Design an enzyme around this catalytic site. Sequence first.
Site, short mmCIF file in Angstrom:
data_model
loop_
_atom_site.label_atom_id
_atom_site.label_comp_id
_atom_site.label_asym_id
_atom_site.label_seq_id
_atom_site.Cartn_x
_atom_site.Cartn_y
_atom_site.Cartn_z
CG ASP A 1 -9.49 -0.71 6.21
OD1 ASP A 1 -8.98 0.29 6.78
OD2 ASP A 1 -8.82 -1.71 5.91
CD1 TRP B 1 -2.65 6.93 13.09
CD2 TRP B 1 -3.69 6.39 11.18
NE1 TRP B 1 -3.52 5.91 13.37
CE2 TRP B 1 -4.17 5.55 12.21
CE3 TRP B 1 -4.20 6.23 9.89
CZ2 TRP B 1 -5.14 4.57 11.99
CZ3 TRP B 1 -5.16 5.26 9.66
CH2 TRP B 1 -5.62 4.44 10.71
CE1 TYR C 1 -9.32 1.55 11.28
CE2 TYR C 1 -10.46 -0.13 10.02
CZ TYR C 1 -9.29 0.43 10.49
OH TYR C 1 -8.09 -0.15 10.16
CG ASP D 1 -8.67 -3.63 11.77
OD1 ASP D 1 -8.90 -4.82 11.45
OD2 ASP D 1 -7.94 -2.88 11.08
CE1 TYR E 1 -2.54 4.12 6.28
CE2 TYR E 1 -2.70 1.78 5.76
CZ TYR E 1 -1.95 2.93 5.90
OH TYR E 1 -0.59 2.87 5.67
NE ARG F 1 -2.08 -1.49 3.49
CZ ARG F 1 -2.55 -1.75 4.71
NH1 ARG F 1 -3.83 -1.54 5.00
NH2 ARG F 1 -1.74 -2.22 5.65
NE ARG G 1 -7.44 -6.57 15.97
CZ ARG G 1 -6.62 -6.41 14.94
NH1 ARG G 1 -5.31 -6.56 15.09
NH2 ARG G 1 -7.12 -6.08 13.77
CB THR H 1 -1.14 -7.70 14.93
OG1 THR H 1 -2.50 -7.92 15.31
CG2 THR H 1 -0.31 -8.95 15.25
CB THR H 2 -3.55 -2.69 17.04
OG1 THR H 2 -2.67 -2.45 18.15
CG2 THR H 2 -4.65 -3.66 17.46
CB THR H 3 1.14 -1.05 14.70
OG1 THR H 3 0.29 0.06 14.42
CG2 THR H 3 1.08 -2.07 13.58
C1 LIG Z 1 -5.14 -2.13 12.94
C2 LIG Z 1 -5.00 -0.91 12.37
C3 LIG Z 1 -6.12 0.11 12.41
C4 LIG Z 1 -3.72 -0.53 11.67
C5 LIG Z 1 -3.78 -1.27 10.31
C6 LIG Z 1 -2.82 -0.59 9.39
C7 LIG Z 1 -1.37 -1.04 9.28
C8 LIG Z 1 -0.89 -2.26 10.04
C9 LIG Z 1 -0.42 -0.24 8.41
C10 LIG Z 1 0.24 0.88 9.23
C11 LIG Z 1 -0.47 0.93 10.56
C12 LIG Z 1 -1.66 1.83 10.74
C13 LIG Z 1 -2.15 2.74 9.63
C14 LIG Z 1 -2.42 1.76 12.03
C15 LIG Z 1 -3.70 1.00 11.63
MG LIG Z 2 -2.43 -5.96 5.95
MG LIG Z 3 -7.91 -6.42 9.84
#
Ligand SMILES: C=C(C)[C@H]1C/C=C(\C)CC/C=C(\C)CC1
Ligand SMILES: [Mg+2]
Ligand SMILES: [Mg+2]
Length: 536
Positions: free
Chosen positions: A513, A261, A508, A432, A515, A252, A429, A389-391
């Site tokens: 989604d 963001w 969201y 999403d 993004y 992406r 989480r 994994t949300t980061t």
């Molecule tokens: C879970 C969410 C909302 C993340 C998903 C998006 C990515 C993993 C790519 C970069 C991270 C972002 C934009 C935070 C959103």
């Molecule tokens: Mg992905």
């Molecule tokens: Mg997802």
Amino acid sequence: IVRPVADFSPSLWGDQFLSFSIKNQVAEKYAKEIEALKEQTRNMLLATGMKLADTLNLIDTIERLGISYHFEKEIDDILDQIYNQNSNCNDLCTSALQFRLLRQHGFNISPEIFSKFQDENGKFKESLASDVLGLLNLYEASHVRTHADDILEDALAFSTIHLESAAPHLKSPLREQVTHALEQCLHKGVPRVETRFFISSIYDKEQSKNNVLLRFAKLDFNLLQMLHKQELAQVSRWWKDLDFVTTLPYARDRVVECYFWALGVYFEPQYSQARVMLVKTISMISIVDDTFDAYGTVKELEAYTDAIQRWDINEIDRLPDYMKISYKAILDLYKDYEKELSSAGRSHIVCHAIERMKEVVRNYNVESTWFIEGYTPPVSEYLSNALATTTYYYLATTSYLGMKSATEQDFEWLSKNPKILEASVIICRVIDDTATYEVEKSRGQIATGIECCMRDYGISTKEAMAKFQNMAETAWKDINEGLLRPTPVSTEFLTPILNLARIVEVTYIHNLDGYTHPEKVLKPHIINLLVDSIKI
Ligand SMILES: C=C(C)[C@H]1C/C=C(\C)CC/C=C(\C)CC1
Ligand SMILES: [Mg+2]
Ligand SMILES: [Mg+2]
Ligand SMILES: [Mg+2]
């Protein structure tokens, strides 16, 4: 042994952000006038002998106009005074506003201030249904509840139904403000986004508007926007000279959305270095996620994950050529951060963000293992992996790097996963998972949050999405509680976490989604914040 097929839309922006040259004389003229306007506004705030309702409306207006960051000390002193005087003798409009402003600023004002507006059962008096300004402030206040505020359990539903009923016949811009509030409450919105709407669509059209505040707000917004555009140009140039657009074409291309963001996390000029560092990190972990999700084979993802844990340029040759690209870029980015922070002797703090990145990548690799195996874990197990994994643990840590006043003790607090951070992560989480459930299911992902939830509890998709919606509501109460004094670190280090939660809600909105699909949600925001100036 080739790869998946590209189905991501390309960046819709092209190079329209790549070069921005600031009209320097305009900047100087704006700033010079702002100084004068700032003092006039400071004196409005310090005016002796104002009524409660007038004071609260002043502070509220300065906050919605986006210029309260100039007056942190004055606003604090005034709210503190109001908090300690215990003034319980007002109507719904003033009381609800009093409650919201104090809570937003961490003053734990009792929710009993609302008892006089309720019957014997704690249900709001329906006789208030014809007081639109009261309902509107009640509505906004209802979103700032903690777990100790069940007195307010009915406030959202009550105010909503009667605002909906009143709206079609209200005068303007009040009608537009009520309609907007019902789609997007103030407390959970992105500040620059709400500010832009308020200045242009509401306050500018108010008969009663204060001309000094309005002019201040417009000049200040457009002046900060020039900085934001310089930052985005500098970041667009950095992204371009990386050229992942062509060499890593599976990924992406969303550096503008990434900047939006970072801008959501903080917009003030003193966080310029912080924003630029943050957007680079968001940009880069986006690349990593797409590698796990839409290109890499499980053998490739294994070596990538291990390379990241070892974090040594020696390790590149164990990786396929296309993973060498991102891996070196990643290692170089952190060496850049270390150089940036060197003059202030804050280089050593970079290791905190690095450890959090290793964690994200470990859990990406677990998630991929689950997908390959067709594994549907219990919700508890699913969350133990999918929260990181949300980061958001990683982005929060990263948000502190460029904040000059962040100390080691602030990172120590964050590293222990405090409750306010955990709630922000949970909101990301579950929102999403609710939004992206359908598409991911069609792509075969049996390990999707909602699916886990359905199989674990033996409940339908509807009941599962509702259970997730409820975890989000619970998490917001924990955020709101986490802002209350005494705070475990400065409010300065809580606001980014709150702002991360807000960006989730905004991106969201209406369960899409925004993004991955920017054209729906993010595009109008990006245009209003970074393309179009407010007309003076
Ligand atoms: C879970 C969410 C909302 C993340 C998903 C998006 C990515 C993993 C790519 C970069 C991270 C972002 C934009 C935070 C959103
Ligand atoms: Mg992905
Ligand atoms: Mg997802
Ligand atoms: Mg992914």
